[model samples]
Target chain A: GHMSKKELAAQIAEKFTDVLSKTHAEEITNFVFDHIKKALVAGKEVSIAGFGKFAVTERAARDGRNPSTGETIKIPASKSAKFKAGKQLKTDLNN
Target chain B: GHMSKKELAAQIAEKFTDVLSKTHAEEITNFVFDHIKKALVAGKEVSIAGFGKFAVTERAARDGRNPSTGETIKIPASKSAKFKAGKQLKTDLNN
Candidate 1:
């Protein structure tokens, strides 16, 4: 069920026979990912219209109860990446 | 804050100056996303090792009550896409 990076690159290479070799496909793959990461780190959202959008969201620090001890604790704020599937992607799954 | 497809393609073209043209970069970008969608539709998981994984999950039908009317309702089963950020992506966010 798991498709690896190599497999993805091979597919791209085949699809773009004239322009991309397996090596170049892999390089582009890495480049795309790297750019996305940098963008998120800078608090920008990456939108691949028909696919989805990736963004970094910040969670505020808050107090939480320790279920076992019944004691309150402070939870520090953090940033994490999130993805929201686009309309086309949602339609694909349903149909 | 939102990055358009053209912007993404332009960045890739800049990063891989020798091999990929702006046009070819756009083509590869579309190809990669298309492949991922196809894999998800086929119920396969696509893993971009240090980036993330995309998969389709099936949700079971369930019964729910309408909040305003207090009437019972049936929620049908559905399929949707999900993404989990990889370790590297998470690390990038914190650092």
Candidate 2:
């Protein structure tokens, strides 16, 4: 199931009440993500050791087959954000 | 180039000095990523609206080829963490 943003913020707030109020926690959470998004837009990589790295990947324009029409088509170049889990995260998932 | 974890933490700390001290901001940043890692390990999806979502994807065991030896092999099943950017993020990147 999906964990909603609000729920995730609440969980962080609960866990870090000593340093952040519920509202502040939520704001900080959004701020973190916002910074990442901004970095990706600028073609910068966000690497968090023991967690993961986020970067923008570019796909070149390419020719593709249109299955339905059995015709060739051109696919435009595009950019996407990708994440690769760091060592610690991979260990935690597999172990 | 990759932005190190310490650099990311420093950026967040700089942005949210109102609610969090530099040290606390760094801690909260780690806490956020750690929380997401735990959720993926638990088979739960972390959805951050207007940002992206993180989840675990499983690849089934399959046969593979070794190019060097030209021998057939079995590839074990594996899990990987994935992130997909949301609408706003995509817009920012293209714009």
Candidate 3:
């Protein structure tokens, strides 16, 4: 379910025979999850061609405030998930 | 034109001979504008099937502040434009 229809459909059709032999849906799900996690750990973006690209981005440290105390604080730097839609996704929406 | 393609196409074919006679784009533009405004003023939402709906909504008064001076302010109520995407628009984006 994590993969888009286009990406999932292709995989299903390619491995139809092997998939039919497997009984567990979790096994299939875990396989895809591990693949994506491996990519993220290596700092490589996973582009599901028709859907979008899932990647990590660095956010710089910045000033923030504690709402309760009204005290200014420095927020530490972090990495975050970013998704950029593909050409097919954009074209489908506009036209 | 403010009208959706389906609505515009229907109008054009029904009056193709008249459209051909008109060389001024402003004539066509003004005609469409007046029609949409009349609907809005009468409290009717303009539903553009494949695109979205444009309508008026009343917003309640609320407390806000002037960020620069840190002054508390009570904002007045007003009507605003609201757009809700139609079924076709939603499906096109997701599927």
Q: Which candidate should be chosen as best, given DockQ against the real structure?
A: 1
DockQ of every candidate: 0.65, 0.56, 0.02
Clashes of each: 0, 0, 0
Q: Is candidate 1 or candidate 3 better by DockQ?
A: 1
Q: Who wins the TM-score comparison?
A: 1
Model 1, span B1-95: residue lDDT tens: 88877787788899778877897778877877877887788768889888888788677887889888999989888788988887656666675
**For candidate 2, what is the DockQ-based docking class?**
medium
Candidate 3 local lDDT, residue A27: 38
lDDT of 3 at B74: 74
**TM-scores of all predicted structures:** 0.82, 0.78, 0.35
TM-score of candidate 2 against the unseen true structure: 0.78
List candidate 3 stretches off by more than 4 Å: A1-18, A63-70, A92-95, B1-95
What TM-score number comes out for model 1?
0.82
DockQ of candidate 1 compared with the true complex: 0.65
Model 2, C-alpha of A93: deviation from truth (Å) = 0.6
Model 3 Cα interface RMS deviation (Å): 19.7
Ranking by TM-score: 1, 2, 3
Question: Which docking category, incorrect, acceptable, medium or high, applies to candidate 3?
Answer: incorrect
Q: What are the per-residue Cα lDDT tens digits for candidate 3 across B1-95?
A: 01122322233234434432233322332233234333444456566434345555555688999999999987456543344544432333222
For model 3, name the residue pairs that clash.
Answer: none
DockQ ranking, high to low? 1, 2, 3
